Write an enzyme that holds these catalytic residues in place. Structure first.
Site, short mmCIF file in Angstrom:
data_model
loop_
_atom_site.label_atom_id
_atom_site.label_comp_id
_atom_site.label_asym_id
_atom_site.label_seq_id
_atom_site.Cartn_x
_atom_site.Cartn_y
_atom_site.Cartn_z
N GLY A 1 57.18 80.86 19.39
CA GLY A 1 58.12 79.91 18.80
C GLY A 1 59.02 79.29 19.85
N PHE A 2 60.32 79.27 19.56
CA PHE A 2 61.30 78.64 20.45
C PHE A 2 61.76 79.61 21.53
CE2 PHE A 2 65.74 76.77 21.11
CZ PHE A 2 65.27 75.72 21.92
N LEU A 3 61.52 79.22 22.78
CA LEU A 3 61.87 79.99 23.97
C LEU A 3 61.66 81.50 23.84
CD1 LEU A 3 65.06 77.99 25.03
CD2 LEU A 3 62.91 78.04 26.31
#
Ligand code: HEC
Ligand code: HEC
Ligand code: HEC
Ligand code: HEC
Ligand SMILES: [Ca+2]
Ligand SMILES: [Ca+2]
Ligand code: NA
Ligand code: NA
Ligand code: NA
Lengths: 376, 355, 125, 376, 125, 354
Positions: free
Chosen positions: A68-70
């Site tokens: 997903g995100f970072l």
């Protein structure tokens, strides 16, 4: 000289001529080994990301993992599993946030645990390997929280459950030393030792201060858990070494990766993962180049290799590419991995001669993080 | 003219003859030795001020007059935000409209009317000469004219360099005359990166010519009643201080509980803090903001009492968007902010920083 | 064009990575996805938190504090990417650190990174 | 000659020097007009995607919309709202699937409706504009389902609710003509008319077969809802025109976009959105080039313009770039939009002279679909 | 390189877009992300549905039916992207259409596209 | 040699002397005029066959002998999938092990024992000549040797070109000798791209040299009981056909209800369909597969009865991964599949196609 695509064309043609049958199926990745390398692509802050599983010996992609995100990747040194801490939203990048840990089988790549982290506690930052870390026994995952204040999350991987948040002082990164202990780097120039339990304030002890406020310690130090060795460069290529093997911090003599003349001439470390450490050889690898003092995140085209004990330079390699990150395999005759965010290409070098051996291209949008297992 | 109007103002400012029983001048409550604030102890400590009758206590804390001259006249901007004025609730349009109000307020200076004020001014030969030279012959014979003139002189006096010297360490640093300590510089950097700058800086962006660390807006930060001050005021247990809504003309219920953002200049020496003087210590004022951000139990607790901060006097229209910043101030950053805010002390009050 | 060369500010084009206010920007210039120099694009959410830098303005010889605020709640714009680090310090000095997604305080708890704005918040000292 | 970035720098320097304040805030997009253009980026099958809202006149990105896996965009012709049918999964590209419709305000870009589509009914395919379509009054969205069988979903935008799936024959694409009526193109070579009430089986009528089995009609026909004109080119550039304005299908004289000599010299339409239709001018635009017959999805470097009523060529433009998709603005002195998937750039041309005026680059990973509102 | 030119098949490199079995492929070659010519990468799910084409093999002069099946449940690989369309027909002839995500029948209802395999399933005609 | 053995099997195949009352031979139920299946109408129509006694009906449909010689011997492959053998439930290893079972089956040819079979063979002077020239003098005097030899001859006969000519329109089209019609090509294309080829093709990938449109595997496709046939069988309404699990040595419960994938060659002329002949029409058999894919109410309905298909006889080990493809066959594709499957008819049975 024959490429993998060529070899496979040859093989497929022989199968067709011989009338060899095969069942289309889901492949297993080759068993984890010393020359497996993981490349993570934070993809310049995109809502979704990719990790590339690579055989460094063949220079072949053997699998991928979606994130997903970072997300923060971790790899178990014994090769038994991989995991990440990751972040998704109900409507791509908007809506309800879910933070979670996934553990993966290293050959099927199937998730074997999906552990939700309550109250969205992950630190969202350009990926630093040591902002999420495994305990040496591989039973616990520790993750950093920055908001509302510095904290460390404890995730029981064995029991597949989130345990607790630990209040810490104004300190950063997580370098585990035992099942119940890790070290952090603090604003005040000390290390903090955190010995924790399932409940109750943890025992927090500060080492002495080991650097001045105007020496800047990079966001990507190298840490060998098995050696208990923390290798921490400054902006100038001066290297702080902390021996954590006794369970307490021992401060080793500082070494300079660059010579006085090199420094006078503008040589500085620069990139993302600027430093690697080989345990068995006790060697330090540093991305360096001629640069202005505030271009510390740009790519570098050279790697200096130096003896950790004496600080003596063993080699200076001309990489021949714009390299942002380095790491090494931890076996004998190790590979030097050189990742180009710009080229989206992992360049695989012989760590002894510095010669480019092979490369793996098309590694996402902005790959930055190299991880290997220390299995030896 | 300009010097002379202000000079007249200087005389009026320290003249107890503008109070019913002649015990009290502007300077009694706005004491130049304490950054134009009230050092006297009343029934509620230094939280609220005692009027001319020696009994009546106000319900609001006496604010500094330093830098009050920089505040724009009361208005509503294009963003629908009220700005400027004087008093914690902006009920005075400007300094001139403000000056007369304490004179006639029975809980303060307690003169019964304008004719009474005109009579006191008339009795002083120095005022007859002073007033008539600036405003014309027979000015003091007309109660309306005299009251207006007195306010005019007092407004002009507060606009002088004496009140707004801009000679704080912060000012000297911004001139290049000296440097911040590492602690003050960290405090400054925190101030301008955290939610503080959203309210306690003149401008949304750019640099102010004459910064006074307020945007002149009205916000409800959700403060509790100061119970000993409220009791001393005698306004009743059922009384609510509605802030800006109390200004005549304002009917918008969304303005309830909102108070003018105070200038942070000289803040270190002008405790207790907030509109009702509820917090004694500067550090406590800073820690109050952590209640909106910190998850720790200590953040719910007022360190001066050991008890919870308290239910807001007005539990609506809170500036949650600005207050709920998502980041807690650790003690190191509170220390830093204290140090920074101390640099906002005018040079002449630097000796007061010890006490 | 030489990535390792000393960064040289200009005050003639806000969409270029050498624009003076962008001296410690990390991500994407909001002007390139429907925002402006100091405003977020439609549909995104303005953070209240920021990383700061003292950036030299070659127009007036003055150094200004830029508080880099993120516009959040959208996938990264992908337009006008830039990464500069004038004065940028490591994560343990977070007020000067630019790898952090400075999205705290954004409406609706928005924490994904879309782009960064470059407002002046004060003079450098 | 002064670029938008340059003009913006001057304005910002002026504000600073004059001491002008301005509150950092969320901008609104300019009011929708004839020259607003939408460019969708299917991103070569990426799990998340982007839409770019562009001021065509200025060549400026004025907004963006995030999407999931191969979303279908629609734009109300009156400019009142935009919408898409999109697809997300609970773990990036794995786990629980959610298909949904989002309706957005066209100046704030805020979602004003989020309508979940039960049982994951969306057709997941390289983006075809007419696989999801608004009824002329804009109170209903119609989306195509291919699995388990061709079907059409009825989404009520006014009540913000999914209503039902319609059983249809073996047909494709959705061309709405009334609040309760749409046309499809069937395998047998006919069109199907589908009339649906509030409940019951839809009334389905077929036209006569209008093309043979060996004549291939492209995936991206032009449809002007306000004209009721269906412009459908074949692989060779033969153009079928169907008038649907009377409520029933009336087949116009077929026209050839290329001459017999050109066809013998290997001139063939090619790209993605190969055809455009301008309503007021009653004019057809086709992406053409010299190519092998099975290179029908490659970029084209030419556009030919022809009179729809007569079939006479009015112009032939050399575009100057590798162009995949075209469309036009529906105003007088229209713009011709030429999108390049390879360059990730919308090139904006005068439709009269074919001259390039401006371009907007950096439009995602593989932008493919241009949409414009017909506001006049 | 000339995109519009008649496609020329080779039988010497399965990772190149001109490999003969890829004559109507759309997406990415699975051999480039840990799969093989006719096998899916680990973690992905193999579809049962297929688009089909007759691909000419230059080596033996024979035409073979390649049934392109998708590997599903992962984001698109991003390695060895290819789009060929030999004999490819519009969507109303789905058996020969390749814009369609042929993930039907995949385990766990996987419907996202990762890559495509190229197995021979018979002779042409 | 090989010719002689086959010729002997040819004699044995049409000889009613191998049934207790001499009323039936192999050819009675495996009729060469009907692609080696049974044209005779019994208590359950053509679903099941009547044995030697004129009364006894079986519980399974008589399959074609065409192309059965291409099936490998019974075994378990490396994926743990059982493959090959003979009979719907694979209980016989190969054609040789299969041949003797009908002879001794009381509901079939009903010979009491191998001794009785030998006795009947001994009565024929042409069998004494035929058998002894191939197997040695006195072979027919030993019941075991005679029975095994007869099984050998029939197996050899079944392995000749006559049982597997590969002269169907399909085979001709693959030799480039003619073309499919438009409808036929569509049917072929549907077949290879839809779920059918996952079971009805010899190999997973590549080209088979002698395709018989079966992978020889065992699958439960979830068919209901054939009510009238089950009644006629006399096995009782409490009986459950467990398919492969019935084979001696098979103990794995995951094999319960699975049956051998039939070869689809001659399918157009060997109705009724499936192991219990439940469906009379070929189209019905195709339409059965829609029940797992289609959401239309008509898909739950057997068009031959107008009632729901019926619950599976064995409600476990269903091949759901293969069957739940997510795509429904419309009528046009059903027409197409019928037309394709018709091209799998041997040349000599093309007149039967009407
Ligand atoms: C009894 C003590 C007392 C006396 C005497 C007094 N004040 Fe005040 N002053 C206050 C209090 C209390 C407030 C806040 C009241 C409120 O907000 O309603 C205040 C508010 C003000 C303000 C508004 C400043 C701001 O930031 O809003 C000005 C200006 C002011 N006074 C000037 C004067 C002048 C001039 C005189 C002499 C005529 C004077 N005051 C007499 C106590 C006093
Ligand atoms: C939402 C706007 C807003 C924000 C954000 C804000 N303040 Fe305030 N501040 C106010 C208002 C309004 C008051 C007066 C409250 C009252 O008395 O009703 C105030 C009061 C104060 C006082 C007391 C001064 C006095 O004279 O009584 C101090 C000190 C202070 N603020 C400092 C800070 C610091 C430090 C921060 C950052 C942590 C901060 N503030 C955040 C608006 C704000
Ligand atoms: C009473 C009618 C009848 C007679 C007589 C008969 N069969 Fe059968 N045959 C069947 C039935 C019914 C089956 C299916 C039985 C089962 O699977 O349990 C069958 C199955 C077979 C099979 C297996 C084919 C496959 O695809 O699984 C072969 C081979 C076979 N028979 C050959 C013979 C030979 C040789 C003879 C002569 C000795 C013979 N049959 C006599 C009805 C008959
Ligand atoms: C799961 C593997 C599998 C799939 C997929 C499959 N089949 Fe079958 N087929 C079988 C098995 C097993 C039987 C025998 C069923 C029984 O009688 O128990 C069978 C029986 C048949 C019969 C009857 C033949 C006879 O001799 O009685 C026809 C016709 C048939 N299948 C055609 C098809 C077609 C057309 C498709 C594609 C729509 C298809 N099948 C899909 C395995 C499969
Ligand atoms: Ca005070
Ligand atoms: Ca049959
Ligand atoms: Na009190
Ligand atoms: Na029956
Ligand atoms: Na058994």
């Amino acid at each position: 000289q024959e490429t993998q695509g060529q070899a496979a064309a040859r093989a497929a043609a022989a199968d067709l001529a011989a009338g060899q049958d095969d069942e289309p199926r889901i492949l297993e990745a080759p068993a984890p080994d010393a020359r497996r390398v993981y490349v993570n692509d934070p993809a310049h802050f995109a809502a979704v990301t990719q990790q590339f599983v690579i055989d460094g010996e063949a220079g072949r992609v053997i699998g991928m993992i979606d994130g997903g995100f970072l997300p923060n990747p971790v790899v178990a040194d014994d090769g038994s599993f991989i995991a990440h801490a990751s972040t998704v939203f109900s409507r791509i990048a908007r809506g309800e946030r879910t933070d979670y840990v996934e553990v993966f089988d290293p050959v099927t790549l199937l998730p074997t645990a999906d552990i939700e982290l309550p109250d969205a506690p992950r630190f969202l930052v350009g990926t630093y390997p040591w902002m999420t870390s495994l305990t040496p026994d591989g039973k616990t995952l520790l993750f950093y929280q920055f908001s509302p204040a510095p904290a460390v999350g404890v995730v029981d991987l064995e029991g597949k459950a989130f345990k607790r948040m630990l209040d810490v002082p104004d300190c950063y990164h997580i370098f585990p030393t035992a099942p119940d202990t890790f070290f952090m780097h603090c604003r005040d120039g000390s290390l903090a030792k955190v010995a924790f339990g399932t409940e109750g304030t943890p025992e927090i002890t500060h080492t002495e201060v080991f650097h001045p406020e105007d020496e800047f310690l990079i966001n990507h130090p190298a840490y060998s858990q098995k050696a208990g060795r923390l290798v921490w460069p400054t902006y100038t290529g001066k290297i702080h070494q902390i021996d954590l093997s006794s369970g307490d911090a021992k401060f080793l003599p500082a070494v300079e990766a660059l010579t006085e003349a090199e420094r006078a001439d503008g040589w500085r470390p620069g990139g993302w993962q600027q430093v690697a450490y080989h345990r068995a050889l006790d060697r330090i690898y540093l991305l360096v180049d001629q640069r202005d003092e505030w271009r510390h995140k740009t790519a570098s085209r050279f790697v200096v290799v130096l003896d950790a004990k004496t600080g003596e330079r063993l080699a200076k390699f001309e990489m021949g590419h714009e390299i942002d990150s380095i790491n090494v395999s931890q076996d004998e005759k190790p590979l030097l991995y050189a990742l180009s965010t710009g080229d989206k290409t992992l360049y695989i070098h012989d760590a002894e001669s510095g010669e480019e051996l092979r490369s793996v291209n098309q590694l996402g949008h902005g790959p930055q993080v190299i991880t290997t297992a220390d299995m030896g | 003219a300009d010097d002379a109007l202000a000079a007249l103002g200087a005389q009026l400012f320290v003249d107890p003859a503008l109070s019913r029983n002649a015990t009290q001048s502007c300077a009694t409550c706005h004491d130049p030795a304490r950054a134009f604030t009230d050092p006297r102890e009343g029934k509620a400590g230094l939280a609220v001020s005692v009027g001319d009758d020696g009994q009546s206590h106000g319900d609001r804390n006496t604010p500094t007059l330093g830098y009050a001259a920089l505040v724009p006249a009361f208005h509503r901007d294009a963003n629908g935000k009220y700005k400027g004025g004087q008093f914690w609730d902006g009920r005075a349009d400007d300094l001139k409209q403000q000056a007369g109000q304490p004179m006639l307020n029975p809980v303060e200076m307690a003169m019964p009317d304008r004719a009474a004020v005109a009579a006191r001014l008339r009795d002083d030969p120095a005022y007859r000469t002073g007033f008539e030279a600036l405003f014309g012959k027979g000015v003091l014979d007309d109660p309306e004219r005299a009251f207006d003139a007195a306010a005019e002189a007092l407004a002009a006096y507060q606009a002088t360099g004496e009140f707004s010297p801009f000679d704080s360490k912060y000012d000297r640093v911004m001139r290049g005359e000296e440097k911040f300590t590492p602690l003050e510089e960290f405090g400054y950097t925190v101030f301008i990166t955290w939610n503080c700058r959203l309210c306690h800086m003149q401008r949304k962006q750019g640099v102010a010519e004459r910064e006074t660390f307020t945007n002149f807006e009205y916000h409800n930060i959700g403060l509790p009643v100061n119970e000993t001050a409220r009791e001393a005021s005698g306004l009743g247990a059922d009384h609510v201080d509605h802030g800006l809504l109390a200004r005549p003309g304002i009917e918008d219920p969304a303005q309830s509980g909102r108070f003018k953002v105070p200038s942070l200049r000289n803040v270190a020496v002008t405790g207790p803090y907030m509109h009702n003087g509820v917090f004694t210590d500067l550090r406590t004022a800073i820690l109050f903001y952590n209640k909106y951000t910190s998850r720790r139990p200590e953040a719910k607790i007022n360190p001066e009492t050991g008890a919870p901060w308290g239910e807001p006097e007005v539990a609506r229209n809170l500036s949650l968007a600005e207050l709920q910043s998502g980041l807690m101030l650790d003690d190191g950053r509170v220390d830093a902010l204290v140090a920074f805010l101390e640099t906002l002390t005018d040079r002449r009050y630097e000796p007061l920083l010890e006490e | 064009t030489d990535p390792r060369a000393k960064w040289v500010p200009q005050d003639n084009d806000i969409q270029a990575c050498d624009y003076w206010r962008h001296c410690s920007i990390d991500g994407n210039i909001c002007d390139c996805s429907g925002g402006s120099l100091t405003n977020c694009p439609p549909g995104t959410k303005l953070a209240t938190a920021s990383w700061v830098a003292s950036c030299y303005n070659p127009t007036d010889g003055q150094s200004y504090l830029i508080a880099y605020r993120d516009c959040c709640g959208y996938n990264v714009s992908g337009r006008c990417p830039c990464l500069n680090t004038e004065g940028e310090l490591p994560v343990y000095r977070p007020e000067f650190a630019n790898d952090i997604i400075w999205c705290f305080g954004a409406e609706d708890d928005a924490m994904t990174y879309h782009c960064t704005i470059s407002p002046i918040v004060g003079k450098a000292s």
